[PDB]
Design an enzyme around this catalytic site. Structure first.
Site, PDB file in Angstrom:
ATOM      1  N   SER A 175      41.427  11.568 -39.405  1.00 27.21           N
ATOM      2  CA  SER A 175      40.860  12.901 -39.554  1.00 27.21           C
ATOM      3  C   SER A 175      39.864  12.934 -40.714  1.00 27.21           C
ATOM      4  O   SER A 175      38.911  12.156 -40.733  1.00 27.21           O
ATOM      5  CB  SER A 175      41.962  13.938 -39.753  1.00 27.21           C
ATOM      6  OG  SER A 175      41.431  15.137 -40.289  1.00 27.21           O
ATOM      7  N   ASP A 221      34.668  17.683 -36.286  1.00 30.87           N
ATOM      8  CA  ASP A 221      35.307  16.733 -37.183  1.00 30.87           C
ATOM      9  C   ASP A 221      35.246  15.338 -36.561  1.00 30.87           C
ATOM     10  O   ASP A 221      34.706  15.135 -35.471  1.00 30.87           O
ATOM     11  CB  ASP A 221      36.764  17.086 -37.522  1.00 30.87           C
ATOM     12  CG  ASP A 221      37.666  17.222 -36.294  1.00 30.87           C
ATOM     13  OD1 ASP A 221      37.226  17.031 -35.143  1.00 30.87           O
ATOM     14  OD2 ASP A 221      38.893  17.414 -36.497  1.00 30.87           O
ATOM     15  N   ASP A 261      38.386  16.878 -32.080  1.00 35.77           N
ATOM     16  CA  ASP A 261      39.225  17.942 -31.525  1.00 35.77           C
ATOM     17  C   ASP A 261      38.996  19.301 -32.180  1.00 35.77           C
ATOM     18  O   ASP A 261      39.598  20.288 -31.736  1.00 35.77           O
ATOM     19  CB  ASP A 261      40.732  17.583 -31.547  1.00 35.77           C
ATOM     20  CG  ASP A 261      41.227  17.161 -32.896  1.00 35.77           C
ATOM     21  OD1 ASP A 261      40.486  17.270 -33.886  1.00 35.77           O
ATOM     22  OD2 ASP A 261      42.431  16.822 -32.980  1.00 35.77           O
ATOM     23  N   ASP A 307      37.284  13.131 -35.178  1.00 33.72           N
ATOM     24  CA  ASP A 307      37.916  12.802 -33.904  1.00 33.72           C
ATOM     25  C   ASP A 307      37.629  13.875 -32.867  1.00 33.72           C
ATOM     26  O   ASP A 307      38.191  13.839 -31.771  1.00 33.72           O
ATOM     27  CB  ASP A 307      39.434  12.595 -34.082  1.00 33.72           C
ATOM     28  CG  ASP A 307      40.156  13.829 -34.601  1.00 33.72           C
ATOM     29  OD1 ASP A 307      39.552  14.681 -35.243  1.00 33.72           O
ATOM     30  OD2 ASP A 307      41.402  13.903 -34.424  1.00 33.72           O
TER      31      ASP A 307
HETATM   32 CA   LIG Z   1      40.564  16.419 -35.783  1.00 36.10          CA
END
Ligand SMILES: [Ca+2]
Ligand SMILES: O=P(O)(O)O[C@H]1O[C@H](CO)[C@@H](O)[C@H](O)[C@H]1O
Length: 448
Positions: free
Chosen positions: A97, A237, A241, A239
């Protein structure tokens, strides 16, 4: 003690003392014992160490007889989607993250991409790993590489009527995370003109670790929108999501207002559906959901609670103010891609700017934004707040901390489940002055 890397919702810690290849292998072994029958999907983000952590996970899983489906460098939502789509026993996303450079982590799911959290398997895995001194076995199952994203891309595009889309000019800012790969795969199927910012995946993060909430990162998207006359801008961000929206003026749109906006977008396609929302900021969502013919369903914040409430309600959509958007047909999981497709469709179909779509809502229900407090005594501080307001007799709700509804204003005050913090959210009925005086009043009490 216990392994610090095992948190409420996922695994995360500094490499190599809190998380390493040895621990990752043991996690794969322990996860095999926790899942129902089937293969396990594995994916990873752009961080330099992530592939080796994934390889160790695969080694432990295959030592335990689990076939592994390696979907490669991907977003977290792709692990969710492919776990569900391929009817896998579970999946793991290796992702750090927005933790520092020497950090990494894992997000774990079982069948249908159902979350594995501290009380639903994750601490059971931790305890197994903590006590595991067995020698590593050798693989008794295979790994297959499945990099085909066709079904995933088709699923994303199914949320919009492509013939109704207009050639909007959209800034996209991957933050050197992984979002640009998917944007570029979607682009041949879309009429938009993309303005690509920090687009190339780079785990060295030359422009900073991806986090669009930090003002200096925020401004890079805003500036690109303004300088290019873009219809709006999207940042993710690492990744991806989480997605973050900037209107044509460069203004960052607070995530609260996207819940009602996306709910109305979804309810046009799935009429009368239920919409799950969190308790931090509520009035605008309840009103927009009901106006669109939907039924709002209050749920404690946290993705595992949201998803489990959506499942038991057959809810078509859930949204948190913290930039998390969940879709029933997407394995009840969150995606950072579906939301901007939906918003691009809403702008295309309505002829209204993103700014116009939210402007009156932000005037009608102004909010403080989430304000975090690290105090010496969270319990004593919350009590100081509640005792101060006791003579006003607010209506109290304890779904998620304390929600106090005074009539023309309300707040939610809760402890974070992922950090040792107190989190404050305040909103009012169209009164910016009351918003500020109450926000400052509560802040002074919390800091006292
Ligand atoms: Ca994320
Ligand atoms: O620290 P919190 O507030 O308990 O939880 C935070 O992380 C969770 C998982 O990303 C989110 O679902 C919450 O909405 C967010 O507020």
């Amino acid at each position: 003690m216990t392994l610090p890397a095992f948190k409420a919702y996922d695994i995360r810690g500094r490499v190599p003392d809190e998380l390493n290849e040895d621990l990752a292998r043991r996690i794969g072994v322990a996860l095999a014992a926790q899942l129902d029958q089937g293969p396990v999907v594995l994916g990873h983000d752009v961080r330099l160490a992530s592939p080796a952590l994934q390889e160790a996970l695969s080694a432990g899983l295959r030592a335990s007889g689990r076939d592994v489906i390696d979907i490669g460098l991907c977003g977290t939502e792709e692990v969710y989607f492919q776990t569900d789509y391929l009817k896998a026993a579970g999946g793991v996303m290796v992702t750090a993250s927005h933790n520092p450079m020497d950090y990494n982590g894992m997000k774990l799911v079982r069948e249908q991409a159902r979350p594995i959290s501290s009380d639903t398997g994750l601490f059971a895995i931790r305890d197994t790993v903590a006590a595991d001194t067995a020698a590593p076995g050798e693989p008794t199952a295979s790994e297959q590489s499945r990099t085909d994203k066709t079904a995933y891309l088709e699923h994303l595009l199914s949320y919009v009527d492509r013939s109704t889309l207009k050639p909007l000019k959209l800034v996209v800012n991957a933050g050197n995370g992984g979002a640009g790969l998917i944007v570029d795969l979607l682009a041949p199927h879309l009429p938009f003109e993309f303005v690509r910012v920090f687009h190339e995946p780079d785990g060295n993060f030359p422009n900073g670790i991806p986090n669009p909430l930090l003002p200096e990162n925020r401004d890079a998207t805003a500036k690109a929108v303004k300088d290019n006359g873009a219809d709006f801008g999207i940042a993710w961000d690492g990744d991806f999501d989480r997605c973050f929206f900037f209107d044509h003026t460069g203004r960052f749109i607070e995530g609260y207002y996207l819940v009602g906006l996306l709910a109305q977008a979804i309810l046009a396609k799935q009429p009368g559906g239920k919409v799950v929302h969190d308790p931090r900021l509520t009035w605008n969502t309840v009103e927009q959901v009901e106006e669109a013919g939907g039924i709002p369903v209050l749920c404690k914040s946290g993705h595992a609670f949201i998803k489990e409430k959506m499942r038991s309600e057959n809810a078509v959509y859930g949204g948190e103010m913290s930039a998390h958007h969940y879709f029933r047909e997407f394995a009840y999981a969150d995606s950072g891609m579906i939301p901007w497709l939906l918003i691009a469709e809403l702008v295309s179909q309505s002829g209204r700017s993103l700014a116009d779509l939210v402007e009156a809502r932000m005037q009608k229900f102004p909010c403080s934004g989430e304000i975090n407090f690290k105090v010496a005594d969270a319990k004593a501080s919350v009590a100081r707040v509640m005792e101060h307001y006791a003579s006003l007799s607010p209506e109290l709700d304890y779904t998620d901390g304390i929600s106090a509804d005074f009539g023309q204003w309300r707040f939610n005050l809760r402890s974070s489940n992922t950090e040792p913090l107190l989190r404050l959210n305040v909103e009012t009925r169209g009164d910016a002055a009351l918003l500020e005086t109450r926000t400052q009043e509560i802040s002074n009490l919390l800091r006292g």
